């Protein structure tokens, strides 16, 4: 094999991570043009999302490696964001080259860029240091979710995600806890219902329903049996599954599996509850005996799900049907079989009024790629919002930020006299590229529309107003409300800036070429 | 993954719509020219296509720009109807539009609200020469019969039109509120008919009558039976193999005869003459239930007794084992209607309900194939038209008068987008443009004169490009529900400014 | 359609660039001078851009351009000659990328050329005044200012000519603009550097007078720009060739006219004659210059006629191209017309005062050969220059680019408060400056980057507290030792290279 | 030639002279739109008429021209 480095190795990084930042500069903000995105499998992606768009590259480098990963570090805990951290590394990278081309070593620009990277979260600090409850942060919260979930282009009237991702994060993810709860909110949604059919439940939805609506829809607080055992066929993962080979088989089989089920399903109720949670569903067979036995229950649970529907409602654990016992069963608020407003989407919930371990954001779409557009609009929605929840610290998105942070940043980048003097000012430059790209996107000359905010930071000197973002010609970062929160931008540059010089104290590298991945 | 940059993607962007695009606008528009599907990649042959899914789809649509309105032009016929060519056309006009903002330096976005508001007035400027025709139920007859007749045109129907025309508006006025396509029961055969149709009194069945049966079932009381026989009768002894060597194979075929048999058991105890059933049996069987001496009809078809249960007031249900678990359904007549050589059993409870029966004879099944769209395409815009009687001047004349408001727009409307309100008012005349030279015609003229001179108020004088010349939209017949022309322009405005917008395509 | 253009202006500005860039080795005395085959094979050796450019230059526009940029910063101060050349490419570094950029050239032209006076001006805050009516203080200032360069080693001697010769021509305590218009700068072959000195009248091409009296006092200054001679054939006698009457009988013709045209040079009267070369005359008729100088009046021959036009001005004597024009006004009125053949070698007629407009300076470059003639030239015209830029420029302003370093933080800083699409060039345009003082590092030796980085915040916190110091060629104090120039080579090198950039990016 | 969005300008005095304002127009200074008040951006009648003339001539006249006989 090969071994390149410095300007090889120099050419070898920033060229990978040139074209990502373009891709996205153009895929960059509201104003952002999507990215149809065609797989080799005739499939079709609209993507103006870096992380979409990065699941959607497989490209090869070092760099196409460290961007799909670091993209979705922004995504999960903060959400938006996912898209200016990588194009902005690439800029950071694209001024590397005329800054080594001007002499400076790439670890004598490498602290000025970090050094520099100081000033800009230093000044994403002084934004907005405000801070608020879940009840007064909920209009935060979807005023944020008007920005976090605008992107995708699914926001206003979306304010129904807005406000179930605003109690789904507090419902699991608490205020004071502060350690990130995406595992603990459940994200569902389903093809047929629509966007602006929208839903926070609290507890678990399981998508089967009793056996028979001709039982009560409504089993009540708590008495959830959690039962892993067949009324349906078993598919144990011990042995295989054979079904009935002979016709004295189906005699027998008929007579024997209905009155164990009869038995059983009496037995559950002996055992007690007014719902049977099966991992193993009721058959049609055992569907009548629910009915007849006169017993509600669930016939289908996942085999995770029961696990799930024990622990996201805190029900005791039930192992299976010989584990049966009274005091141990899952739990409650209550349990109903639930139409969200179109029959095709019909879950049976149980609902937790009484501990909600996995809380359940349930979208609906018309399809699958309009609930998706929901979800990850959602999920960047319930991520910036369960960071402000947590802490509301919010930032004036769209550049003007950077806008008063670079002239800030390069100033300061000045004070030191260490060659980074220089080093540390160009760093500056590199913040203006993103409201740069999206004022591109916005339909604007970026030049001429930055230097408005210029002006305005002239004027301010921090963000308030602004620029546009979504494109409208109204420039305001506040009344446009264009924000972030003030954690992950931070968290951008925090990703954005190292990574950069991480790269850059790794120019050492065994490669016959860039495309090693 | 291959990274497709903005260069190639606007281009690709363009070319798809287009490639497919001149290929239904042929078709599409009036008709000066069509797409005849030279076929093979599949086969030897040569075909003849006015459907834009025929063309669409036969042909590779490979290219992911191609994808978005092949699929997406599809819906809009799959909805309103005859969305196909339109949503495809429209689009690819938009893709000429784009490419010059495009090439002259143009954010898509600036493109975006010049096409995506200029839609709207253009939108608003069709409901203007949109003109509600529901005034009597002559009137609105009329109207869905225009209505009819518009969507079917630029298609190759050779006794189709006139006759639908009568059904689809028939559908319509029966059902007062909707049309009906649960009721029109579409039966297709060969009967030797060019493309002659009619509305069948009740429904036709096809079956000979043979072995022992008598053939002609005089009142006839039906029996409805949701579960027939296919050739064994299905219950707990139904099933055996008792194949131990090479003879059995040869006598097992054997064994199965006596299935047969205990079907009559079933039949005999509900002791109705008619027993009409969902599952066929063959001519062997035919001696064991005809020597019954009951008639068990095999292969009574669901949707047929579904249309007598509606018109002859009884109930047609599901889950049939005894009886009474489906209500009895009355005929007058289970006869055989012979046309030409064919031999039909017939049942006739009704006649021409509020539930048809429609025979399709045709010797040709894409005919009979473009029939059905077309006749899916006029209902669904004659129930629209139900709904929205305004039948808006078609022919490009709506196009004209979009293209001179809008035009007008873009002059005051936008400080900057009054390049692409105008380039969208330009697609707008496009549609017109290519079929007049195919009638010999100048579309310049006309775009430029009949446009203004309608724009200024003769908007019922049209195009005629079938002529190449000015008639009035209305007179014409040319005009179709306000809602699919909108329609047609909901989507074609909408798959341009996608791809527009798409500045880069991963492919893997 | 403004591709080409933009592909001319990369091609001129590239090849703009390219020019200016080899002299940013060369630039400064610590430039390393270039031994340069030509065209004609042969070396040339040259430090400063001017002479490097013009001694070996192919033709592009952009580079003749420069080549008069650079020419231009001689023919503007006579100083700071290498300087100008380097901020061009310099500018054009931020230009080109700010075209790359985007940045209109219309604006970036105006963009720098706002941002220029804007730069001038904080300049004129760093610029630090001198007496320019005090003749020591110029003598102390500009020989340091020469000391800040190479050369005092005829200069501190030549700086009390230099000074005084302009302090004698020095009207103003401003001291105002004074080119070297009424300084005559003559050399003579033998004397000394000390034999090199100023004298108050128009020193004349030797003397060249035949019976010319050696020294006529209170001269009336004859100017002859007719011919002397009688109408040639084969010489001032005019012979017609056969037999030798005839061209003997033609001189009653010609000597008559010869001695008349004398006799009419006296007639009016001169007691000197200014009379050019005879190649800068058709031709001078020796039978009336015998007689001419034979009717006793002292004559000069053999003169430039720019000395004649230098002459003309500064002591007065007014063009005589002909008799009429022979009048007490065109005939100059000396105060003392003398010849002095001595202290030193070499004769030459010395007008010792004169009546003269201006004031007026003759310098006589003596020395123990031409080269101590010549280095003292060399000697002035720094003295000469710098004397005349510093006077033009109240103030003064320590050297090395350390002023950019200040500026381009300076500008830069406010850039920032400019906004406005320029911001980003208003820096880069500051950003240009310090490049040049690096190369200055880089061509002193040091590093040209970590050091003006430094000094630019050096030049943060007293604005001197450090600076580029040519002989440490590092980080000093440059008014510890003084590095020190007018204020113009700054000014002229920028007011020059923005100009120079400016119409390229305004040219096609 | 000012460097300034013409679409824009051009619209704009467009949009001003679909509101028919010719007392608005592209000030080219600032390159704006902006008022045509005679600020010193308006032209004597003289100028365009005159200008506005021969190449809506020429232009024409050249289309004249087809078959081009160029004996050289």
């Not at chain 1, 002979?246 to 037995?267: C, G, N, P, R, T």
């Not at chain 2, 975006?112 to 409901?127: D, F, N, P, V, Y």
């Not at chain 2, 009740?202 to 079932?217: A, Y």
């Not at chain 3, 070499?346 to 004169?354: A, F, R, S």
Request: proline share 2%.
């Amino acid at each position: 094999k090969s071994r390149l480095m410095g300007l090889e190795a120099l050419k070898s990084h920033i060229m990978a991570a040139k074209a990502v930042a373009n891709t996205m500069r153009t895929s960059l903000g509201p104003n952002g043009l999507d990215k149809m995105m065609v797989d080799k499998d005739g499939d079709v992606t609209v993507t103006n999302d870096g992380a979409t768009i990065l699941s959607m590259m497989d490209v090869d480098h070092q760099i196409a490696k460290l961007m799909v990963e670091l993209s979705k570090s922004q995504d999960d805990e903060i959400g938006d964001g996912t898209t200016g951290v990588v194009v902005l590394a690439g800029a950071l990278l694209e001024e590397a080259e005329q800054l080594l081309d001007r002499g400076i070593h790439p670890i004598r620009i490498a602290d000025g860029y970090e050094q520099a990277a100081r000033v800009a979260i230093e000044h994403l600090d002084k934004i907005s240091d405000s801070v608020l409850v879940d009840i007064k942060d909920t209009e935060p919260l979807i005023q944020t979710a008007k920005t976090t979930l605008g992107s995708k282009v699914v926001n206003s009237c979306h304010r129904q995600m807005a406000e179930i991702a605003v109690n789904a994060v507090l419902t699991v993810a608490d205020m004071e806890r502060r350690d990130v709860d995406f595992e603990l909110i459940k994200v569902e949604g389903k093809v047929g219902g629509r966007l602006e059919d929208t839903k926070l439940i609290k507890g678990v939805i399981v998508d089967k329903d009793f056996s028979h609506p001709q039982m009560p829809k409504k089993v009540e607080d708590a008495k959830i049996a959690i039962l892993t055992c067949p009324f349906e066929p078993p598919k144990p993962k011990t042995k295989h599954k054979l079904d009935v080979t002979s016709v004295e088989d189906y005699k027998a089989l008929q007579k024997y599996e209905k009155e164990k089920f009869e038995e059983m399903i009496q037995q559950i109720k002996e055992t007690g509850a007014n719902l049977a949670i099966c991992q193993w569903g009721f058959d049609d067979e055992a569907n009548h005996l629910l009915l007849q036995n006169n017993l509600p229950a669930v016939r289908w649970v996942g085999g995770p799900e029961i696990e799930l529907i024990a622990i996201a409602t805190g029900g005791r654990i039930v192992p299976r049907f010989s584990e049966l016992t009274a005091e141990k069963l899952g739990f409650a608020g209550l349990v109903q079989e639930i139409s969200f407003g179109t029959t095709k989407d019909k879950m049976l919930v149980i609902e937790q009024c009484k501990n909600s371990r996995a809380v359940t954001i349930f979208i609906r779409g018309g399809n699958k790629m309009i609930i998706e557009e929901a979800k990850r609009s959602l999920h960047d929605a319930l991520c910036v919002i369960r960071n402000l929840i947590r802490d509301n610290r919010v930032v004036y998105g769209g550049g003007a930020a950077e806008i008063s942070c670079a002239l800030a940043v390069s100033q300061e980048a000045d004070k030191c006299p260490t060659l980074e003097q220089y080093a540390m000012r160009a760093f500056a430059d590199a913040l203006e590229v993103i409201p740069m790209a999206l004022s591109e996107n916005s339909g604007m000359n970026p030049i001429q529309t930055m230097t408005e905010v210029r002006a305005r930071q002239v004027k301010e000197m921090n963000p308030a107003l602004g620029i546009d973002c979504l494109h409208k010609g109204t420039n305001d970062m506040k009344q446009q409300h264009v924000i972030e929160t003030l954690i992950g931008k931070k968290q951008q540059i925090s990703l954005a800036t190292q990574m950069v010089r991480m790269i850059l104290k790794i120019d050492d590298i065994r490669k016959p070429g860039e495309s090693e991945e | 993954a291959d990274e497709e940059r903005a260069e190639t993607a606007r281009l690709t962007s363009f070319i798809g719509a287009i490639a497919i695009g001149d290929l239904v606008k042929s078709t599409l528009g009036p008709k000066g020219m069509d797409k005849i599907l030279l076929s093979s990649g599949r086969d030897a042959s040569l075909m003849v296509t006015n459907d834009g899914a025929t063309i669409l789809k036969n042909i590779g649509v490979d290219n992911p720009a191609a994808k978005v309105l092949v699929d997406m032009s599809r819906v809009q016929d799959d909805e309103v109807g005859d969305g196909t060519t339109s949503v495809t056309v429209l689009a690819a006009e938009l893709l000429r539009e784009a490419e010059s903002l495009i090439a002259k330096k143009i954010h898509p976005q600036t493109i975006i609200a010049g096409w995506r508001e200029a839609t709207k007035a253009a939108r608003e400027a069709l409901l203007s020469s949109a003109v509600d025709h529901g005034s009597d139920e002559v009137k609105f007859r009329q109207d869905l019969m225009n209505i009819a007749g518009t969507t079917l045109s630029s298609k190759l129907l050779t006794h189709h039109k006139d006759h639908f025309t009568k059904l689809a508006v028939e559908a319509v006025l029966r059902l007062k509120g909707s049309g009906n396509l649960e009721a029109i029961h579409i039966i297709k055969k060969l009967g030797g008919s060019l493309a002659d149709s009619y509305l069948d009194e009740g429904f036709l069945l096809d079956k000979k009558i043979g072995v022992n049966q008598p053939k002609r079932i005089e009142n006839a009381k039906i029996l409805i039976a949701n579960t027939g026989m296919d050739t064994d009768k299905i219950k707990i002894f139904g099933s055996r193999v008792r194949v131990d060597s090479t003879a059995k194979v040869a006598e097992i075929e054997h064994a199965e005869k006596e299935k047969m048999k205990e079907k009559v058991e079933r039949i005999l105890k509900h002791g109705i003459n008619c027993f009409i059933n969902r599952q066929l049996i063959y001519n062997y069987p035919e001696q064991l239930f005809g020597a019954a001496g009951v008639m068990a009809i095999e292969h009574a078809d669901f949707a047929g007794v579904e249309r007598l249960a509606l018109v002859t007031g009884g109930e047609i249900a599901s889950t049939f084992d005894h009886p009474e678990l489906v209500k009895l359904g009355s005929c007058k007549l289970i006869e055989e209607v012979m046309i030409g050589e064919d031999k039909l059993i017939h049942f006739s409870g009704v006649a021409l309900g509020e539930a048809c029966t429609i025979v399709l004879r045709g010797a040709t099944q894409q005919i009979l194939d473009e029939a059905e769209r077309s006749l899916h395409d006029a209902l669904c815009v004659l129930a629209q038209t139900v709904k929205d009687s305004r039948t808006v001047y078609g022919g490009g004349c709506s196009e004209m008068l979009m293209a001179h408001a809008v035009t007008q727009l873009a002059n005051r409307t936008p400080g900057k987008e009054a390049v692409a309100m105008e380039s969208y008012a330009k697609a707008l005349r496009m549609l017109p443009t290519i079929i007049a030279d195919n009638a010999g015609y100048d579309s310049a003229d006309l775009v430029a004169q009949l446009r203004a001179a309608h724009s200024e108020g003769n908007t019922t004088a049209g195009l005629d490009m079938r002529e190449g010349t000015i008639g009035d939209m209305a007179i014409l017949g040319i005009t179709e529900s306000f809602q699919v022309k909108r329609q047609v322009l909901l989507s074609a405005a909408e798959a341009a400014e996608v791809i527009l917008r798409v500045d880069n395509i991963i492919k893997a | 359609d403004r591709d080409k253009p933009a592909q001319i202006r990369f091609s001129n500005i590239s090849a703009a660039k390219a020019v200016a860039d080899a002299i940013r080795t060369s630039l400064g005395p610590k430039g390393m001078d270039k031994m340069i085959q030509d065209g004609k094979g042969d070396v040339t050796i040259t430090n400063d851009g001017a002479t490097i450019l013009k001694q070996m230059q192919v033709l592009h526009p952009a580079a003749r351009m420069l080549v008069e940029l650079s020419k231009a910063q001689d023919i503007e101060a006579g100083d700071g000659t290498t300087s100008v050349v380097i901020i061009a490419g310099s500018l054009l570094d931020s230009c080109t990328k700010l075209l790359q950029k985007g940045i209109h050239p219309t604006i970036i032209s105006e963009s720098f050329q706002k941002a220029l006076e804007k730069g001038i001006e904080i300049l004129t805050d760093m610029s630090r005044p001198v007496e320019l009516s005090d003749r020591e203080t110029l003598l102390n200032s500009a020989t340091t200012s020469l000391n800040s360069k190479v050369v005092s080693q005829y200069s501190s001697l030549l700086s009390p000519m230099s000074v005084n010769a302009v302090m004698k021509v020095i009207d103003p305590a401003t001291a105002t603009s004074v080119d070297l218009r009424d300084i005559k700068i003559v050399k003579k072959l033998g004397g000394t550097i000390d034999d090199c000195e100023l004298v108050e009248g128009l020193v004349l091409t030797q003397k060249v007078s035949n019976s010319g009296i050696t020294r006529v006092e209170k001269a009336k200054i004859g100017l002859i720009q007719f011919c002397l001679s009688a109408p040639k054939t084969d010489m001032d006698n005019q012979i017609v060739v056969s037999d030798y009457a005839q061209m003997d009988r033609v001189l009653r013709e010609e000597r008559a006219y010869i001695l008349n045209l004398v006799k009419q040079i006296k007639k009016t009267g001169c007691n000197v004659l200014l009379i050019q070369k005879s190649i800068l005359r058709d031709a001078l008729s020796d039978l009336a210059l015998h007689f001419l100088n034979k009717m006793k009046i002292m004559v000069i021959k053999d003169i430039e006629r720019e000395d004649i036009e230098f002459i003309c001005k500064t002591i007065g004597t007014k063009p005589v191209a002909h008799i009429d024009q022979f009048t007490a006004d065109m005939l100059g009125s000396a105060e003392l017309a003398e010849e002095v053949n001595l202290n030193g070698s070499g004769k030459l007629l010395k007008i010792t005062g004169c009546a003269s407009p201006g004031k007026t300076v003759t310098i006589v470059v003596r020395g123990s050969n031409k080269l101590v003639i010549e280095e003292a030239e060399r000697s002035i015209h720094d003295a000469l220059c710098v004397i005349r830029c510093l006077v033009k420029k109240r103030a003064l302003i320590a050297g090395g680019g350390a002023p950019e370093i200040e500026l381009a933080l300076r500008l830069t800083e406010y850039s920032r408060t400019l906004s406005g699409m320029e911001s980003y060039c208003v820096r880069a345009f500051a950003d240009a400056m310090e490049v040049i003082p690096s190369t200055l590092a880089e061509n002193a030796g040091l590093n040209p980057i970590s050091t003006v980085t430094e000094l630019r915040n050096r030049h943060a916190q007293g604005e001197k507290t450090a600076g580029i110091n040519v002989r440490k060629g590092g980080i000093s104090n440059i008014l510890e030792e003084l590095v020190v120039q007018p204020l113009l080579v700054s000014v002229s090198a920028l007011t020059l290279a923005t100009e120079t950039v400016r119409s390229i990016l305004k040219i096609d | 030639n000012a460097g300034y969005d013409s679409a824009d300008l051009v619209a704009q005095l467009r949009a001003a002279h679909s509101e028919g304002n010719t007392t608005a127009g592209l000030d080219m200074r600032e390159g704006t739109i902006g008022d045509m008040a005679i600020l010193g951006i308006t032209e004597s009648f003289q100028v365009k008429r005159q200008v506005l003339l021969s190449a809506a001539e020429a232009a024409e006249v050249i289309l004249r021209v087809d078959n081009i006989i160029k004996a050289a």
